[PDB]
Every structure is written in structure tokens, then in C-alpha cells.
Amino acid sequence: ETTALVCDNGSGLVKAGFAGDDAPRAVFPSIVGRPRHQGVMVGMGQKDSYVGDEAQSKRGILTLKYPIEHGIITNWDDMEKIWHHTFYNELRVAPEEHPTLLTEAPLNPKANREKMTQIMFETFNVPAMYVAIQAVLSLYASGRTTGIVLDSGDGVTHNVPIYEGYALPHAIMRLDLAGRDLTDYLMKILTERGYSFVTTAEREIVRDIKEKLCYVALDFENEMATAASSSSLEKSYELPDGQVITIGNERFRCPETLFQPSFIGMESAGIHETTYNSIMKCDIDIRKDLYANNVMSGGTTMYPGIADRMQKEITALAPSTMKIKIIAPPERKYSVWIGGSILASLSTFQQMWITKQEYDEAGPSIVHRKCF
Amino acid sequence: ETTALVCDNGSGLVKAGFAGDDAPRAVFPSIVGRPRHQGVMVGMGQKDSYVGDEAQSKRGILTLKYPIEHGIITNWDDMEKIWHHTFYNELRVAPEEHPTLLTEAPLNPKANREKMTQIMFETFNVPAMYVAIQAVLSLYASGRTTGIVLDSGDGVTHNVPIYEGYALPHAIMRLDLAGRDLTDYLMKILTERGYSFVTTAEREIVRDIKEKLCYVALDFENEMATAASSSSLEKSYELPDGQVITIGNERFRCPETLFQPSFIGMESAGIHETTYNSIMKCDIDIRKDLYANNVMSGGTTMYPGIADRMQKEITALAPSTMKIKIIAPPERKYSVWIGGSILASLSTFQQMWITKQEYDEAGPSIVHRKCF
Amino acid sequence: ETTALVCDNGSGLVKAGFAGDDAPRAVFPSIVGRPRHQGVMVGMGQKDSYVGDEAQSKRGILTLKYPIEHGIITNWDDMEKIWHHTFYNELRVAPEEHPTLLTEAPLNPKANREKMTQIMFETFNVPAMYVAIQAVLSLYASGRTTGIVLDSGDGVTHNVPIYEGYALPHAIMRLDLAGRDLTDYLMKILTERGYSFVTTAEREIVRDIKEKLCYVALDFENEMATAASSSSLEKSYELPDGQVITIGNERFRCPETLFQPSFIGMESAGIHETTYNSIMKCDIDIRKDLYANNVMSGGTTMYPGIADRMQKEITALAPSTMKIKIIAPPERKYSVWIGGSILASLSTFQQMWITKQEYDEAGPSIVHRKCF
Ligand SMILES: Nc1ncnc2c1ncn2[C@@H]1O[C@H](COP(=O)(O)OP(=O)(O)O)[C@@H](O)[C@H]1O
Ligand SMILES: Nc1ncnc2c1ncn2[C@@H]1O[C@H](COP(=O)(O)OP(=O)(O)O)[C@@H](O)[C@H]1O
Ligand SMILES: Nc1ncnc2c1ncn2[C@@H]1O[C@H](COP(=O)(O)OP(=O)(O)O)[C@@H](O)[C@H]1O
Ligand SMILES: [Mg+2]
Ligand SMILES: [Mg+2]
Ligand SMILES: [Mg+2]
């Protein structure tokens, strides 16, 4: 009778909802905003901190901080604030009568999940909770069993291969290059056209510009030549103070960092080579099914050229006798939450919860014994 | 009214069917596979063991083990699993109403036969059972009564001479050099070209390469010279992951171990010398008939150069006035099963079964006093 | 009158010197570094590539590549750079008047040895060159004739048994698991404590951490329990930028892959099982002498728990009436070079060189008819 709660706490967004639903009920940015100026009007119910959409609406007088950086919770008081807001203000629910399912990026510090379990059991004390890997939930949402999931969000980009329900943990690859780094690089290269964005609110503006006008090119050199030749790739964006900026090759130079990380001085390979190397680390007999089941999840995969570019690159890397399919569902921005709702509604999962009694007996160390 | 069952349990393959048929109904690999990677998805009916074609089709996440090694059952739980699979899932029969005929290589340990009888009477209890030697079944299938049978399979290569229905057990020669050793030698010599196959799953790939591309050279030195001079003996093979590997002299070096065991460090003589030595241990009055009635059986005799090579070698060893003939029927891979089905259907064999009453009276030791 | 050169090119280090000596003259890492950032100061003697110690010293602005992977030369221009550095800059010698001895792991591709011969005779033209197996040299340096050598370096781990100077190639075992794999595994498992090492410059830092702080436990479960109980096994390491990290069970979990390869997803057996399997594949009359003469060589055998652990494991596997003795000399990091210098100084070896006239007459294939 007691329904469960699925809460995906990503680096940039929080997606919370109820188990068994098709879409998350609450989606809001994971920011805590604090006033930086002097208050002069007495009364009027001024608060010392702001969370979520309230921080975004008043961001012109606030400094915004992200409690999660690269999938790791850096500030715990702010994260506790975010959880309090998502339980009592958005979902409008009492945490002490609902089991909770949370998510974790692969190859993360163990202290992160230990303190997550401790806060959930000692501050928002729940009957049960479960910490799950995001790529497995994305595969649950896709409805299939074999596939290699590339999950790219705001802090982390990771590839995880799964075959017939079994993971190959030695082939999991993690890259700390995601949407926030793309926002930073776009911010840096906008200074070539005279536009100066420095503050935290201007970072939100640049992120909005990236979400609106950026795309992944099929061929980088040809698009550069086209942008140099004619003014056909230039788009105009209107700022909140009515100013209009015009961007050209920066529309496709920003997500190209996903394929050329050396644009921001990193030594790693692109996401295509990382995926290919993750497939080559697996057994030979499962590579054929891995090539045809590339599943893309997360908001950083929403650029409207990324599937074709990925297919072209992996086809250039893979043998010519192989069929390569890139799976990009239209609702892949919410794939982790949809998979968590699918998993938490299964009758075969109800014995895999971490109960309050087990936590009391074992302490904040059972999260490694019961969760993979 | 009760139909008899014929099950040939070799080192590599299980050939099971009903007596009176022309071909075995169920031929499947004799392996048990178990998961080695980490299962991350719940439900979906995951099993803790896979047997037969289900293990081979899913081998990329499994470790594969052969219960039978060199014709001796090493693991008995897995052997019971194989027998259960071949009685229920493949043959779709209830063993409580069908006598069973089984096969055993010459010069085997007694305990193997004893435990086979005990399992067949106490786990899959049968009205009666029998254990037969493979070479007499091969000579039954060949249709003749006199001849020398060279049976080479996956674990054992044995020569048995028979004259007018009487065997000479002192001339029986057993050699533990068969198909698995050839697969291992091919795996070793494929590293000369940079190809690495290490795991148990890749052993099956190398086995397929051996079954498809290898052959026996009529003269080994001239074949080596031909391979060194021109690239006319090279063949390409496409791997499961789409890689293409080219092999040259390894096509005829791998089965050359049958004629030169010293390639794998074995001091024994070749198969031709073993056949000649078995013939020369017999009486002088039967060697003329044994020379002209050489019968081959098993899957190791399926290389497309072995009959001519054996004829040439034995003609080199034998007197020039004798006629040497090699009998290589196209169905010789299934010769043991065909001979068993012919034998189990005879009206004079129904008195030679080991019934349940006699097993209760004598225990698992009547298999020596009733089976030769 | 011409002094012979002894050069050992492993996967990680180059040990070069003159025959007849006791220690190699030049021991330097086998890496080539190339700049990855933008040069802004004109002139100043900037080079396009760096080799050896100079590449390691300037690694903060360089990308470092290993020309040899798993004992196989993957890049040949970098290999020519390494050999030019070790001939003209380190040894300070002219190659045209010194014969050269090179080493190679067992079960390598033939093309590697052929191209080594071709490069040594056509680019660094030597009067003579000879390629030898590393384990035979280790037995030469050990002073004895009978023994089984376990040589583990940076790319390969191979077992070679020798009895009275005769080798048994069918019992030679090779495992592609060595120091670099342990470095990668340590990089993976240091992420549990929040440390992120990604770039190739940080791989050397992790290698230094492994060389200074890692060790092999005598009992794995007991040491895991001890680490879980108290913080007595924890050690601190200072990073190049002054940061201090602390590691606990990661000290002994990293080399345990040599005994449990499944930690990195490999299906193979541990080094103790591989040594026991190599002993069991030999003749029965030499196993007693192989048991008492386990010879350890290579830098991966330098952990301060590995001899006792190997003795315990082999004594567990071997019959109780056998004397198992592990021979781990203090200078076993340079056993290959010492054996090569011993062999190249023998008067009975001077007729086994491959002169330039023989190479001209036969081509780059006499290295198979002359070298074992
Ligand atoms: N349509 C889009 N095009 C490009 N980038 C997008 C788009 N939508 C979202 N993003 C990026 O995705 C990131 C967040 O995606 P998501 O995975 O849903 O959140 P989280 O990373 O917190 O899980 C943001 O940094 C944003 O810049
Ligand atoms: N066409 C072929 N060429 C060469 N070898 C073959 C061929 N077909 C099967 N084999 C080998 O025969 C062996 C098994 O043959 P068979 O005697 O029928 O089974 P078992 O040895 O279990 O009795 C396998 O090891 C396989 O490698
Ligand atoms: N004290 C040590 N303890 C453990 N490992 C070591 C130690 N010193 C060196 N190594 C390892 O030995 C490897 C190379 O050893 P060596 O065999 O001398 O070189 P190569 O493998 O190139 O022949 C390196 O990868 C290094 O990690
Ligand atoms: Mg996410
Ligand atoms: Mg057989
Ligand atoms: Mg070495």
C-alpha cells in the first residue's frame, strides 16, 4: 500500500517523483542561492537562502552554488536543503512513510553513498532506501537487457556495458567532461565576439544559449569552412535586458569538446573512442550485440547532431562487417528516472530494499554489501 | 513395446536418440557453463548454470567446463546435469520406461562404469541398462564382422582389432591424443601471427577454425616448402567481432600432431605406427584381413586428407604384397550411435541387459561380469 | 677485442650495458614523450620529442607513450628512437663495432623478432646480433642449470621449466598480466578514496605509489579483516604538488590480482596455479627438481610478501612429501641482464652469433634457424 519515491539527484538537475508513474512529478535545478547585497527594506519575509526555481527567478541578487560537482556531493548542508525542498515543498510528502530510491554515478567515492544513506536514515528517516547505478536504470527504461549505455549529464559522462543482465565492471569508463564543462568552454569562446559573461547568473544564461542554439556537426572541418564562407550558420539570441548576441561557429565548436577534449586541455579521448575502447575490453562474443545496442541517456546527448556523428565515428572505428545502431529515444533526458520507476515497481525488487533494521544492525556500511 | 535409448557420451559431444533410427535425434555440446560476471538486473529468470547449446550461445558471460576429460568423468554433478538435460529437455522422454545403452572407451577405470550404472539405476532409474565399447559399435555400423577400428574423438584415440566377432584385447591400443589437444596446439601456434585466444570461450572459436580450415598434408615437408614459396595455402576467417585472421601452414601443422605427437611433447608413436603395431600383435593368419579392413570413426577423422595419408603410411610400413584399404564412410562421425542403435534393436541382445533385479541382487559390480 | 653489448628492452624499462660486467650501465624508462600544449617562447632549444629520463622529468607538458605493449613492439619509430638513445646518448658507443644481445618473451609473434633483426642489421648495423629468451638468461644468472623460472615484468608473466639445460616448450606458460595492469587497477581503486588519476603523467605517480607502498599479504581475508578493524596498515604518500594521500587495504589489494586475476575480469588462474600447472605438464622424474628450484625474476616479483605467499600456495597445491623452495635473490630485478652478460662472455657462445654475411645470405628469417 505504501508507494515508493524515485529521486534522481544529478549534478545540475533534480528529478523526483513517485514509483509507477511515467514522468517525474518535480524537476528543478540543484542550486542553492544566497544574497550577496545589502538588505534595506525591513520585513517583507526575506529569507537567508533559496533553492531551485526560486533561486533561478531571483538570481540577479544571488550567488548560486551547486552542491554536486562531478557527481560528488561537495556541500552536505546544501544537499540536505535540496532534499528537504524536494520532499516537503515539491513532492508534498512525508519521508517517514515512503521508501526512497536514489542514484549514483559509477566509480564514485564510497563516502558519498555512505553519507547519503546516513542522511536518509537519520535526518529524513525512511522505512527503506536503495542506491542504484544510473546506466542500469537507463537500460531498464529502454526495455532491453543487452546494451552499452552512454550516460552524459552535467558532471559525469560514463559508458557501462551490460549483456543478458550481467555487467562487465572491468570495462566501465568514466570521463569528468559533461554539460557544465561545455558551458564553461562556451563562456570562454564567447569572449572572441566581445560578449563578457562572468557571474553565476550569466553562467545560467550561457547554459540557456547552449540548450537553444548549439548542435553537433557531422564534419567539423566542413562546418568550419562553411561558417568562414557564408553567414548561414549564425543565430541571434535575445538577452534578458533586450540585447541581441549573434553566434556562428560557436554553435558547433562547443559540443565538439565531447569529441575533442583537447579543446579544454584534457588528454582523454572523445566519447566515441571511449565507447569503442569500452566495447573492446569486453568478451569477443558479446561485441556484436554491444555494437547494435548503443543507448544514449542524459541531457548532454540532446544536441541535434550527436547520434549521426556517433554512428559515423564508431563505424569508422569498428569493422566494416558490423551493424552499429545508436538508440536515442525522445525521452532520454529522463531515462534514469523512468528506469528507477520501472525497477521500484517490480515485485521481484521488494526484497532488495535496505530496511531500517538492517541499517541499525550494520551501520552506514551495508550500502556496499546490498547495493552494487 | 518399450523403445531403447542410445546415448553416446564422448569427451566433446552428446549424441542421444532412440534405437532403430538412422541418425541420433539430439546432438549437443557436452559442456556446463556458469556465470562469472556481475548480474545487475533483477528477475528475467536468470539461472545459475547453462547446459548444451544454451551455454554455447551465451558463452560470452560464462565459464565453460567439460565434465568428461580424456574419456573419464571428472565432475559428476555436471554429468548428472547433462544426463538430465538429454533425458528431459532434448529427448523429451521419461527414463522410467526406456532401457538405456551407453558407451565407454577401452582401458578406462572401472569406477567410471560403476558410477555410470549407479547413477542410471538410482537417479534416472531405468528398467535396464547396458555399457558397450565404442569400436564394436563402429564395426556394427560398418556392417562387417572383421576389421581394425581406429576411433578418434575429442579425448581418446583407440585401435581395436576384431576377427569374426572375436576381439584381441591384448592388441588394443589407447592414446590420449585427440581433438582437444589439437585445439590447444592450434591455440599455441596461432600466437606466432599475433592472434591471442586465452579464455574458454575463445577455445570454441579456435575449435571452429580447426573444424573449418584444417587438413592433413599428403607429404609434410613438401607442403611446408609450398607454403613457404607462395601464399597459395592461406585462408581467411572472420571472427565473431568482425575481425579477419589469415592462417597459412597452421592448417596442416595442427593435425600433423596426430602423426608426430612430439609436436606437443608426447613420446608416443603416430596413429599409423599405432595401427601397424596393433596389427602386428595379432596372429599372423588374420593380418591380411585386418590390413584390408581399416575402419575409421569419430570426428577427429574428418580432416580432408587423413585417409590417403594413413594409406600411404601403412603401405610404407607393411609388406608390399598386402592390400591396404581404409574405410572412411561419410557418416563416420555418428558411427558409434548407429552401431549402438543396430545392436540395441537385435532380438539376440534383449537377453543381455542389466535389469533392476540383478542390480539389486549384485550391486554396482555386475557391469564387469555382464559387459565386456 | 670488440666488446659485446647486452641490451634488455622490456615493456617498461631499458637495461643496457657491456658484456662481462656485473650491473647494467644505463637503466631508463622506455617511453617517448611529445608535447601537447602551445609553445610560446621562440628558440630555446625546444625538441619535438623526448626519450627516457628527460621525458619523465618534463612529463607535466608531455604525453608519454610506451613503444612496447605486453612485450610486443607496437610503434617502430619510437623503438628506433629508444635504441638510438641507448646507443649514442647513454652507452656513448658506436654500434657498428659491437655485437648486440637482445631479449624476447616466449610465445611472441615471429614478426617482432624478424623486424628487430632487420633494424639491428640495416639501421644500426652491427657485426652480429643474437636474440635470447629471458627466463633462460635468468637461470644463467641464478648460477644453476635446473629450475623453473617465473619472470614477471611490466607486460608479461611467463614460466619456463628447464631440466639439466634442456627446456620443455610444451610446458611454457604465459599470462598477459604484469606491472602495468596492476598500475591501472590501482588507478581504478584509488577512486574509492576520492583520488582521480587520469593522465599518463599521473600513471607514473601511481606506479611510484605502487613501488613504494604496495605489498602482498600472506592471507588475504585476514589482512582485509585487520584493515577493517584498525588503521594500522594505512600509509601516507606525498604528491608532487604537496598533497598527501592515505591508503589502507589498497596496499595489498593491488598485487592480489597476481593471485586472483578475476579482480580485473580475467578468467585465468593465479601465478601459483600457473606454476603448478607448468610443473604438472612436465615429466614425472623432473618434478621433484623443479619444486626445489623456483626462481623468481623481474620487477613485479619485488613486492615484500611474494616469496612466502608463493611458497604457501605451492605447498598447498603440491604433495606434502615435497620440498618447495622459492629462490628470490636481492638482485632479481636485473637477472635478465646479468644472465645476458654471462652468456655473451662465454667462449662457447662466440660461434652462435648471427653475422652480417649470414643475414645477407638468408635474410631476416635466419633468426628462427639460429635463435631458440
Ligand atoms: N536540449 C539540450 N541541448 C543541449 N544540452 C542540454 C539540453 N538539455 C539539457 N542539456 C544539458 O544537460 C545537463 C543536465 O542534464 P541531466 O542529465 O538531465 O541533469 P543531471 O546531469 O543533473 O542528471 C545540463 O548541463 C544542460 O546544459
Ligand atoms: N569437420 C571436422 N574436421 C575436423 N575435426 C572435427 C570436424 N568435426 C568435428 N571435429 C572434431 O571432433 C571432435 C568431436 O568428435 P566426436 O567423436 O563426434 O565427439 P566425441 O569426441 O565427443 O565422441 C571435436 O573435438 C571436434 O573438434
Ligand atoms: N619495488 C617494486 N615493487 C613492485 N613492483 C616494482 C618495483 N620496482 C619496479 N616494479 C615494477 O616492475 C615493472 C618493470 O620491471 P622490469 O621487469 O625490470 O621491467 P620490464 O618489465 O620492462 O623488463 C614496472 O612496471 C614496475 O611497476
Ligand atoms: Mg544524471
Ligand atoms: Mg566418440
Ligand atoms: Mg623483463
Swiss-Prot record, chains A, B, C:
Places the protein is found: Cytoplasm, Cytoskeleton
Enzyme Commission number: 3.6.4.-
A GO term for molecular function: myosin heavy chain binding
UniProt modification remark: Oxidation of Met-41 and Met-44 by MICALs (MICAL1, MICAL2 or MICAL3) to form methionine sulfoxide promotes actin filament depolymerization. MICAL1 and MICAL2 produce the (R)-S-oxide form. The (R)-S-oxide form is reverted by MSRB1 and MSRB2, which promotes actin repolymerization.
InterPro entries, per database record: Actin (IPR004000), Actin/actin-like_CS (IPR020902), Actin_CS (IPR004001), ATPase_NBD (IPR043129)
ADP-ribosylarginine carried by residues: 174
Domain of life (superkingdom): Eukaryota
GO biological process: actin filament bundle assembly; actin filament polymerization; mesenchyme migration; positive regulation of gene expression; skeletal muscle fiber development; skeletal muscle thin filament assembly
Major localization class: cytoplasm
Entry-annotated residues carrying N6-malonyllysine: 58
Enzyme class: hydrolase
GO cellular component: actin filament; actin filament bundle; cell body; cytoplasm; filamentous actin; filopodium; lamellipodium; skeletal muscle myofibril
Gene3D superfamilies membership: 3.30.420.40, Actin, Chain A, domain 4
Keywords associated with the record: Acetylation, ADP-ribosylation, ATP-binding, Cytoplasm, Cytoskeleton, Hydrolase, Methylation, Muscle protein, Nucleotide-binding, Oxidation
ATP-binding as UniProt keyword: yes
Protein role: Actins are highly conserved proteins that are involved in various types of cell motility and are ubiquitously expressed in all eukaryotic cells.
Family the entry assigns: Belongs to the actin family.
Additional remark text: In vertebrates 3 main groups of actin isoforms, alpha, beta and gamma have been identified. The alpha actins are found in muscle tissues and are a major constituent of the contractile apparatus. The beta and gamma actins coexist in most cell types as components of the cytoskeleton and as mediators of internal cell motility.
The name this protein goes by in its record: Actin, alpha skeletal muscle
Upper taxonomic lineage: Eukaryota, Metazoa, Chordata, Craniata, Vertebrata
